[PDB]
Design a protein around this ligand. Structure first.
Ligand SMILES: [Fe+2]
Length: 187
């Protein structure tokens, strides 16, 4: 049981099949992403780090059905609290560990945001989120080692909202790619 990709290339091929249609079986995609055993030799071309902030590195555009990308988290790097613009979002660890904090959605009223769950993603683990699940923040647990994660978003999206933990107020954020297909972007 569970089709096991032996390479990152196998995984991409399978994903093209699983997203070719109208339905997407979330638990099936998750298990297959989790079954791929992270191999740094295969994804090192995408692992382009920045001193001050995590980077987004596009791997594959999934024939318009999804975006597959690798996020590189320096020592102590973390994300804002954010949503996912009504898409599916899968997150798989490739190296290190991320702490995921799930938050409830704010009301129109201003106050402190509420944590709904907290966990550390294990080696090779694939997590899943969408807007109905909640909001989340993700961060490198380590101040001495990096983390690397593989993200799949379907449909693709290039804007989301970031939330202020103190008030729940949000701002629209346009995300950019640090590199695409192993090639640094103009910035
Ligand atoms: Fe996210």
């Amino acid at each position: 049981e569970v089709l096991k990709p032996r390479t990152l290339a196998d995984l991409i091929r399978i994903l093209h099949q699983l997203f070719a249609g109208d339905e997407v079986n979330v638990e099936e995609v998750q298990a297959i992403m989790e079954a791929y055993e992270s191999d740094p030799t295969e994804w090192a071309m995408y692992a382009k780090f920045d001193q001050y902030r995590y980077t987004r590195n596009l791997v594959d555009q999934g024939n318009g059905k999804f975006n597959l990308m690798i996020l590189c988290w320096g020592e102590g790097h973390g994300s804002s609290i954010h949503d996912h613009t009504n898409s599916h979002c899968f997150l798989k660890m490739l190296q290190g560990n991320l702490k995921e904090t799930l938050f409830a959605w704010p009301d129109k009223k201003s106050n402190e945001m509420v944590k709904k769950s907290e966990r550390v993603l294990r080696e090779n683990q694939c997590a899943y989120i969408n807007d109905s699940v909640g909001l989340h923040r993700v961060e490198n647990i380590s101040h001495t080692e990096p983390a690397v994660s593989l993200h799949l978003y379907s449909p693709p999206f290039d804007t989301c909202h970031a939330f202020d933990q103190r008030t729940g107020h949000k701002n629209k954020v346009t995300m950019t790619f640090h590199s695409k297909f192993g090639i640094r972007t103009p910035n």
